[PDB]
Ligand binder design. Structure first.
Ligand SMILES: [Cl-]
Ligand SMILES: [Cl-]
Lengths: 361, 92, 352, 341, 341
């Protein structure tokens, strides 16, 4: 075991470079986990892999706990690890080793009050698989008193939750004929459902500059076939929902938009959100401003551990981490070095701020 | 074709409806709807969109002469999906 | 030339089973610079030979890998790459050691990089057996760990279950193709599990592997195809397993292909004793293992009837994994142990 | 009432190669429905019609599928040509007519099956019966025994597939390797079966197709081989042998069934012999070269079983497959006498 | 800093035939990222890196895809061999280096594009730019003009597909019909273009493939034809002609682009001429036989546009495609002088 180092000595950029170097696509996080556990042990954590091989390092003492829930796995492939002009390139730099590195460093820097624990987790199998990491935590651990999810929100952004998701299927069957008028074929019928639904979504969210407060549709697949007697067509559509539009609402519109076809629907994700007024949000808004930032409340579009531990534990929860999420899963995924340390300072205060709330009780 | 599904029940509707003694103030509407079997029921949907809800409805589907259908079972379409890393193992 | 360097180049040339020529070419080019007479045989096997004489020591490894590429990189002492463990690692060790080994007179040193070992064909190995006469010693190029030696591998059979179901109206009673194929898998899985109860080592177990299960519908007929790999212990012959599998299918169609039965070598055999002794001579504590998968060892073992073991650096548990890797030091560690082992086996052979 | 001959041309006129039996099955059931059978297709697409009442069942198991090839359906001086005239719509039509003609005791029900896929290796038509039906008390297989013939058995069947790859560069071609494999297999079987009297007891390999191709960088070749087995050589044994001759290539094997034979002195045999003999015939007991669904339902069910029907089996799968119309009338009446007893 | 030559072999060593540009694009972007470009692939997979700041943009539009065929990557006495050495990784590498070397005014940003699918008919790499990007103020197309050459234009392109069916019985074969169609098309173009000096002004059909097959009952034949058009003959006109020669078969047509040419006295031309001339060269203005993405982005954007790069276009698509390494250094410096002005 390495000698104890200063939590202030190691920078997040330093830790991230080492962490981004080790390959860890989902299912193969073991060398990355071992390495990080060693690093955390050197920073004052008590670090060791749990039952599912998640990297877990703890600080503090007491009946109260702040969990920082990140993931150590990535999509496969190697983004050529390089640092050029104050920008770090590497797989997982944004999704989500950057936020994970920030968790480790800020957690070791943060001043804790008595009666407060701090558990930092580098979960496995979140990216390509069914999150064996987080599900193991739920099945084996008590619900902590606060959860910060390690996902890129930007250093000056704070994520309160995620948009709802709905998978739509429109299907239509029509008898064959020779006609070439409108709605003559099943494919035309399926295509026009897309247009009229696409039109509605634009109607609903007119003028809304907050993209996560819009309902945005997607035609993932359209197919058609015929047996000479009948023609059939199917349109598969994804709907990403703002908080003010429930699935069953959106599903009712789609259903009402279809006449000659039938619409079926799966709710992939119910919408989920920690309220703006909540203490944990107050802490992070305060933390960002305390370090010279103009904080933005936002929602994640894509799924994450927030989709699981949120509904499970029901505790106050936010997502925070440096990096531009648009760079997730990209061949040149990168993050500026400044944003890393800035987010580290902010999270340091936020952990202190949350621990202060919890200790006041 | 359709002896059971559902021209038989439809034929029964037509005949029994014309035989049935009606009391005053009661109408009797018999409907041979279209596009129910292979399509999205343009027939019934048109009735809903154009007509007042009647006071009682008998659906022309085979229940057997000595059977009466009160409704239908719920249906659920499930999709299970799983992704696992490749390996050489042959265990469970 | 270092083993880690050759491997670093070797693992940079994609060679999935059936597309080995580029890697085979490059390797033949490298072996000549080390003293070999290198040439791809009629099958495409990279073959390097040196010396001459009545006798021959074949280092039989394989150049092909399973598909899916692991981005090639060295990090913290460890080399990442497809086939780095299975089995370009052992092959690189084979090459370096064989040209580094002090060769007695009257001994041939053949190094083979076989094609299509990772598949049902073993086209490269079967070609060797069909065209070449038996060597006096064979070392199998598979990962055993640099401090381990492999005594044997399970046999294997490839099964394909096909079934087709039409359309009456019975959406309730008479049922689907996917269900019939899943029914077959359950039966086979159950049977193998019942046979294998209590047995601690996989090598002495019979284990099936449902590699694929796909159903389809054209509107007329539904169809389902399962692709299954059966791993065989010594106590269960390919003929018997196939007979069992065939009997389990109720309405479907079972199709079978035999790779090889299980094969193992006694630890009391001299070649084993040498390799155990070889590992201690470099600070090692030798371990003997019997493995889960199958090898070309299961082919050349019986066909040539010569002494044989498997040796190679690396963690065989990393076989076919998305981040297959091996520590660079184990390479030269196994290279030294192998260089020794070759020089000594050659003596016993020359001895008689 | 309809004769077997008018029934036969109608069935023969409806093409039903393996995989495409639905219209034939569909039409046959209404012919069975018109004749009074409770008749519909089952879960596998078999044409099924059943007679009588009770817990005791005789099954007339024929098959409605044929091998491909268009044989012009025509009558030339009392001789009906057509694919399936002999193999095996003739016997199947005979089943439909004699099956209705006969009178049964109470508790005894008769069932006629026009199975699908008998001609091909799947035999899934019969396999669906094994999976979804109780074993009948007796079975008559619908294959051409001749109007005065009684088939007691058929050879087993295993299909073999050899595939070999060779690089398109320098050093035996894929074709040569495949051919030599065939040479080895053909020789092994010939040396095994040397001097054996009848086909039933010999092991005979059949090279149905050999095709070599050029992948681009590889030479490829495949050989489709059917293998017909005697009782002495099991499918299991025959596959082990086939495997041992593979050498550079691989052999893929699919078992149909082992050989099967009905014991010569069975009561069900006597019933047919009498039916033949009493109808002025000189019966010859036959064992056939090909295979049948008898080889599956036999070992499965275990009930008394024989094969009977009009037609000369040598005409099976031929470009001008045909049967004399006279043979149809006798076979129907003989099967009836047989059925009763 | 890295020279164009060290950049070229690295790119040439990474195979990128049309459809398989991802690893090449991926690698090129990090080379652009290491060099200081803000660089990632875009929505279509194009390799994109952009320089400078502001609302004014110069685009260096090259392509990273190549035709198939393995040309052994090697240097033989200052001569680099490899697929793409001329067409068109050479020009693309030149873009990456000269694009960074040059110094720009404020408000002027430079963007380097390694487009996908330029070599094939889709040209979707360039089409994605037209769909997703604002029109730049000028464009340089990355094609081999020669270090002392300036390409002002390329011919248009239309791909033609002739398919004909004939019964495999009695009465011209599918092959004969297809061949005679080619004869008609070839003659029409030759009689049109008779005595014309340069390839740019001629219409030239290209029989890339003709293949006849036997369906079984039908004889089949298909002919893949590329057609290169001068300004005088539009794609529309050329298709009408092609249609009129079909007779017994059908012609399927897919338009790439009409011909395009940059007017000889443009300021952007003068800039390159000077860059050539001032660097001790004797420039020859060229119009090329093949086509380019210039033919798409030209009529789309309308900004000043030329094609420039190292390499002799006659070596395009050849088994030993190569470029002198000396040509790379000059072309980089010349492009730079050109870029500045
Ligand atoms: Cl005999
Ligand atoms: Cl001219």
């Amino acid at each position: 075991m390495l000698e104890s180092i200063s939590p202030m000595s190691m920078t997040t950029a330093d830790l991230l470079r080492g962490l981004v170097s080790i390959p860890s696509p989902s299912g193969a996080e073991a060398p990355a986990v071992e390495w990080l556990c060693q690093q955390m042990a050197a920073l004052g954590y008590q670090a060791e892999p749990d039952g599912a091989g998640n990297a877990v390092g703890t600080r503090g003492e007491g009946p109260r706990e702040i969990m920082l829930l990140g993931h150590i796995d990535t999509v496969p492939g190697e983004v050529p690890v390089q640092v050029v002009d104050g920008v770090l390139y590497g797989r997982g730099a944004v999704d989500a080793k950057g936020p994970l590195a920030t968790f480790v460093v800020a957690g070791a820097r943060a001043k804790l009050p008595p009666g407060v624990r701090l558990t930092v987790v580098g979960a496995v199998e979140e990216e390509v698989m069914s999150s064996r990491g987080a599900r193991h935590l739920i099945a084996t651990r008590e619900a902590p008193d606060a959860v910060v999810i390690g996902e890129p929100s930007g250093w000056d952004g704070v994520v309160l939750g995620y948009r709802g998701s709905v998978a739509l299927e429109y299907r239509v069957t029509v008898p064959m004929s020779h006609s070439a008028g409108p709605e003559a074929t099943a494919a035309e019928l399926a295509a026009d459902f897309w247009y009229r639904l696409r039109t509605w979504c634009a109607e609903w969210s007119v003028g809304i500059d907050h993209a996560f407060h819009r309902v945005e549709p997607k035609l993932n697949a359209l197919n058609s076939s015929s047996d000479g007697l009948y023609g059939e067509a199917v349109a598969r559509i994804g709907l990403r929902l703002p908080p003010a539009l429930s699935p069953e609402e959106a599903i009712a519109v789609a259903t009402s938009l279809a006449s000659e076809g039938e619409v079926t629907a799966t709710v992939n994700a119910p919408a989920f959100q920690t309220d703006k007024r909540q203490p944990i949000v107050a802490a992070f808004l305060a933390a960002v401003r305390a370090h010279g930032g103009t904080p933005r409340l936002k929602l994640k579009t894509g799924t994450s551990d927030m989709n699981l531990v949120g509904p499970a534990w029901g505790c106050p929860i936010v997502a925070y981490g440096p990096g531009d999420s648009r760079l997730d899963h990209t061949p040149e995924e990168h993050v500026p070095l400044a944003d890393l340390e800035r987010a580290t300072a902010i999270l340091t205060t936020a952990i202190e701020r949350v621990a202060a709330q919890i200790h006041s009780g």
